[PDB]
Symmetry: D2
Subunit: 303 residues, 4 copies
């Protein structure tokens, strides 16, 4: 079992990957970008890729959204919501008062403003490429900064890095959502708290065209948790997360409705919700209701 991820080593993305069951003791390959992590999977060199999909402090989200929606034959098999905790690290013997410059990824920098502005008002920012690269950069004697903002992972992995501050994020409950992406296989088992992702191409652009797509879910009691339009036909695709599993009668039926409107629709997997909240199923929308209605129609058709 081999996983790729958005590298380098010790980023928030790897930290997320290591909480996946068995991944702490699996082979984890850092890739320089989402496409390469994804190519490895597509080429059979890796079983799955761990990539950010919401609120990454390393960047990478838009590239993930591009990749799953313009790609071919990929399935999301797992998601993860990982609390972000920022630490400030420096080389041993460097005190808080010695810090004149701090390197990190721009996303992390923006999220730690209150702490830094209060506790290090004389510290100026040095743009980094990732939090991990900013941290590893300290290990060079000539580094052009004195501290970095990074994940607790990197701080505990590196004996040459000392934590000077912990939990310095503006929001203590901030989270990144990640997805684990593999080649198509069997559908993960339904848990009752599941999510389904599709990418729906727009056949014709006119008012109410999205409405028509959205209705396939809504008329069937299927809640949505994410929607994004992307210019690419009607010149758009819609990337959509829905509550439920392809196995649920209401969801299977919504998928059929989607295909009829847009037969190039892509299925991106059904998988367990990281939040473990089961869909509240309206009774007229239940598996039993679908079976009862189909049985009633059959009795007419065969009467």
């Amino acid at each position: 079992v081999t996983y790729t991820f958005l590298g380098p080593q010790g980023t928030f993305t790897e930290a997320a990957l290591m909480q996946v069951p068995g991944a702490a003791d699996a082979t984890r390959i850092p890739c320089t970008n989402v496409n390469t992590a994804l190519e490895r999977v597509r080429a059979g060199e890796a079983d799955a890729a761990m990539v950010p999909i919401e609120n990454s402090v390393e960047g990478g989200v838009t590239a993930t959204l591009d990749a799953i929606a313009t790609g071919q034959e990929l399935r999301i098999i797992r998601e993860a919501l990982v609390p972000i905790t920022f630490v400030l690290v420096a080389r041993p013997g460097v005190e808080l008062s010695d810090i004149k410059r701090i390197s990190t990824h721009g996303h992390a920098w923006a999220q730690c403003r209150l702490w830094v502005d209060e506790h290090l008002p004389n510290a100026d920012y040095v743009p980094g490429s990732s939090t991990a690269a900013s941290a590893m950069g300290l290990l060079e004697d000539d580094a052009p900064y004195e501290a970095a903002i990074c994940a607790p992972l990197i701080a505990a992995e590196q004996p040459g890095l000392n934590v000077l501050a912990e939990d310095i994020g503006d929001n203590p409950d901030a989270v990144t959502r990640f997805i684990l992406v593999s080649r198509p296989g069997a559908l993960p088992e339904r848990t009752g708290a599941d999510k389904t992702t599709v990418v729906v191409p727009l056949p014709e652009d006119h008012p109410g065209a999205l409405m028509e797509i959205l209705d396939q879910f809504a008329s069937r009691g299927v809640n949505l948790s994410r929607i994004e339009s992307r210019p690419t036909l009607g010149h758009y695709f819609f990337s959509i997360d829905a509550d439920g599993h392809a196995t649920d009668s209401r969801v299977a039926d919504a998928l059929a409705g989607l295909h009829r409107i847009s037969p190039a629709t892509r299925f991106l997997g059904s998988y367990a919700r990281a939040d473990k909240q089961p869909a509240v199923v309206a009774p007229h929308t239940s598996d039993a209701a679908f079976a009862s209605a189909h049985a009633w129609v059959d009795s007419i058709l065969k009467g």
Copy 2:
């Protein structure tokens, strides 16, 4: 083979039954009212009942809509659209100048205004129970009127009735819609020019509730030709909707819509699929053909099974 129909004999209703193939030589039983007509079918004592459902010269329409919405299951197997022609009728020897009083059903009267005002301006309307009864009343001694407005049928059948004026109605396009109703059996063969009728009880009364029911048809490209709400104490939404859709129950979009209806309202009644009197084919919208439905099912199957 036994038919019932809304009586008495000689009404526009009978005339309509008379047009159904084989009926002229079949047993035709006139019944007092629509319920009595249907009752006989439900009880196993008649094969089908011919009842009006729109623009009845004799009344009976609301009775029909309520009767088919409750009780033993029934199916519409045929519809008829019968052109309405009115004749003015009287005993032999009676001329236009001799008419002071005219009896007919109020529905007939209201449609013969133009001719009557023009040619019998001094004549008074005497309300009748049906066109046929009005006509038959003339064969009695000292009938309290001198003319009747009725169907050509009853004039042709009664020797004592003379036609004083032909085709006296206000509306050239006037037609009555009838339905022939039986106990449930097989669906007839689809034709591509079919109608499907359902009665949908409202489960819960709120804005957009009907829209939710109508969307089952609209979202699957199913055109409607009739909707009517009716109060009722049987449903906890307090209404039912009587609906005619374009299509046959076996058409994939229609079967699918029917399933959607049952999910919202499990007490939905299926009232049959049957050929359109006017023979006009359903227009099948994009994405809603049997083929599109089958492609979509196969796609979902590949996901489930792959």
Copy 3:
């Protein structure tokens, strides 16, 4: 103040009219049919016409529905829900056991079946034109029946008619709904439990065309209590009763929406509900919500 009604005198329709405030002591003109009652009003000879619209035991409903929907310049100014109580009447000295034949309107006959089948199983039916005409027919010595089913009004008006049975209807709570129709004037005052009627022509016949019409009400929290399609353009009109008064912001706005789709839409009046049940107004649909939203748009437009 002069009213017409669906005659003759002593029908359930007149009984309904006499419960209208001041009508018991107004001039009430019986008309042989709905059109004539309506012509009188249209010609200025009568102020209003009382005609049945739901569950008439005298007939007349479909003619009412035809008239208000194909007519010109008429407004419904009042509705009434009148409990139906049937009485069986005969000439003095005629006993229950003397009744061989009963005349009434077909609608009344169908609604009294249980009583008659139990209490008079030997009585056969004689079709009548109205319950009142059936009753008045007894006053002739040569009448071809012995009893009639009619309104309590006719029974109490006519000293020559004796009640032999009362409340013989299958349903003790059965009701007829009637409407009072006048020429256009000022809108009746809003009560908070109001109804509005329109007739909407269908511009084009296609799936979802009615949906579009219905949405104008639904998207604005406006409940409907009656809908009927009629073949007559799209070849239909829709006769519609909605909850609310034209004065309510959500209703005025629904009316505007209707006009845009179908500019030949006819307004048939706003008037008090006979059931006196106030609409439950969703907060985002309230007059205050409409005023707040319009004020917010104005601040943008004028900023």
Copy 4:
């Protein structure tokens, strides 16, 4: 006149600001991030901020979507669609054979694969914070790489930077969408080819909730060109929707839609009406013209007042 933009200098973002009329001779302040850019505008210290909103070679897009959805009111006054052209850059004397390491923003790297794999198959990517920083890093002693991928802008401005390869991107149609954002003032004049942007907080999370919001546009013939949901803890539905519609706030169908949105969600933010970069006029659907709206208002008025 003072602009801020997502820095540093020489990025694709600056190049885009540079295209706005009068900007080449205006004060242009580079800012660390999107929030800092907007902050300056909000504080009264800059007139407008130029920030990316789609397909940014430099990042910044999610920052933009979140920043304009909360806090002090802002308005988009202009949008720009800027074609992306990549150059390969190095110090003088350095040739293709001399390159083992290339630095750029990951977004640039991912779009230059074809050319790089073909012509520099042995070169390794060194991730940079921005294209500009990658380029500027080459002017330093013993930079840990030998080439950068950046905008033509920074190559033209830096003497120490030599263009080794021109136009090396994978996608001919690649463009970045930017927005120029100011404090609220007057609506600009409508053109018939306008865009309107709003941010709509979800009040309550249930199936069809978004549909209810989208229907405000769809039921009034208003076409959409962008929708994005974003999580947030501020709304009790837990999301907001970022939306671009075809039209100008003064168009009757748009003002009407805006009112519908406010009724559902009173905390709706108005983000401006502004000319479309591509100059494509709104198509005005049947029944939705200013004239139709005015006829309908006048009809309702006749009822109210008559």
